[PDB]
Design a protein around this ligand. Sequence first.
Ligand SMILES: NC(=O)[C@@H](O)C1CCOCC1
Ligand SMILES: NC(=O)[C@@H](O)C1CCOCC1
Lengths: 265, 264
Amino acid sequence: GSLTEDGLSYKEKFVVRSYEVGSNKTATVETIANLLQEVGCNHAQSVGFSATTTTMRKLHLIWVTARMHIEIYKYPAWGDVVEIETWCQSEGRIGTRRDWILKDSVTGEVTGRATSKWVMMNQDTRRLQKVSDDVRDEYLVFCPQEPRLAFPEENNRSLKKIPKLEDPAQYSMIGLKPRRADLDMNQHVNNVTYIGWVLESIPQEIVDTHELQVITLDYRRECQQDDVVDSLTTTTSNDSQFLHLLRLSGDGQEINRGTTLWRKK
Amino acid sequence: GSLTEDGLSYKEKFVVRSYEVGSNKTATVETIANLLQEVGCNHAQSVGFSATTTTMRKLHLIWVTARMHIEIYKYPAWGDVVEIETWCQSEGRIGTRRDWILKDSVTGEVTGRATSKWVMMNQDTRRLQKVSDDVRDEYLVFCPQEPRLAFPEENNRSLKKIPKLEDPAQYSMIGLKPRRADLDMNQHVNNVTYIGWVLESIPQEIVDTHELQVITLDYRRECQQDDVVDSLTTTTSDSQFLHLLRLSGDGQEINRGTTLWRKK
Ligand SMILES: NC(=O)[C@@H](O)C1CCOCC1
Ligand SMILES: NC(=O)[C@@H](O)C1CCOCC1
């Protein structure tokens, strides 16, 4: 991969692997989400990060994902080349945003797009905070100055408020636990794992007859390595919509909430 | 990737990804095993196998992994380029073997090696059988004629008999279940997932102070999408462990194995 000519965005190509595809012989949404995470990581490395700056490290500060929104029009097939372009943007003192555009390498057509909201937090106390001016200036030299949005629309799905699923849930998948493959290099549960856990409570019949078009996921609390999770889903709706909830198996402490939109195959 | 000049083996390079590494910032054994599986699929595609032959499809026959043995000397770091060479071999009517050699792209040094034993079976009845004769012919044109072994030493770790772990196990991880990411394109549990489940019963302290050097795994029965598994481990000793994967209810055996670990 490489930064574009202006140095304000980063591009990388990926060839879809055999174990990365589902029953349709096309990449899963978890494969897509892992690839977005990989291109984001390579973008940070290319401009001297890690995404902590020198000031953030001095104050034990980290960037944390608050929301992830993905819309896929076409899943790349096994063996296809997918090109992803990503960039970051400052959102004042609220936090930062990372956007992605997915394209078919052969045709150049947009096959998907994603946006994520990030908030600043003390690594030890877990206390969120607004962005300091010294930090804001340090990453503004790597972001475009004029707004560049993957989701520019007037009232788009990426910014919609998500409600809390009420008991009883229509569907559920109980006793989900992360294994070592679900942990990143810092022994924290990978953000993509939660996408998988949310989808576990979608019945196999929807999965077999529909394609996932949109997923919006809020991250409220982290699942520890020794925590057990319950995945809850209720139909809110040819299209099918669902409301999701991930909560701890015991006390019922909320860890995630989301919505998915599916279309008939 | 591409087949070598003689067309009897296949090579592919891979750049290690951020989510593919563990605490040591080096690729996990599950990442390694996924890469071997990927180079194996690309080798089959390149010689027209889509690993069923023409006669196997009409007869409802498939190749199934019976044993997987992996020995790693150095795990590639995040960002490194690893080159893997793989080839197949006929083992008479017992079955077939697929071997791999892992190398550092920059130095050309061997950083690991793997071998797998495969058996033939009817995909419906799940009944094993001796390969054939008219099927051996179709495979032998894509394999080297003289023996080429990733593990050539006479009576080596890859061919050792594995015993059954006796209850009570020293360590255990119970209630393991596969999710959709653990399934392949045919809705079967990926063979690499069982490697992960075996390692789940190794205490975090061994993982934090040792590096996995060798793993040998026997595949006895498949875990269905709706099955629950218990992972059992006992120290037999470097550190060595004996492993058992069995169904959470009846205790039906699905895998057995051994791992050897070195102090970091
Ligand atoms: N590192 C990242 O960009 C993560 O926060 C994302 C990656 C895509 O899946 C959702 C979480
Ligand atoms: N397809 C294959 O080569 C599999 O049978 C292997 C892959 C890596 O180790 C576990 C089993």
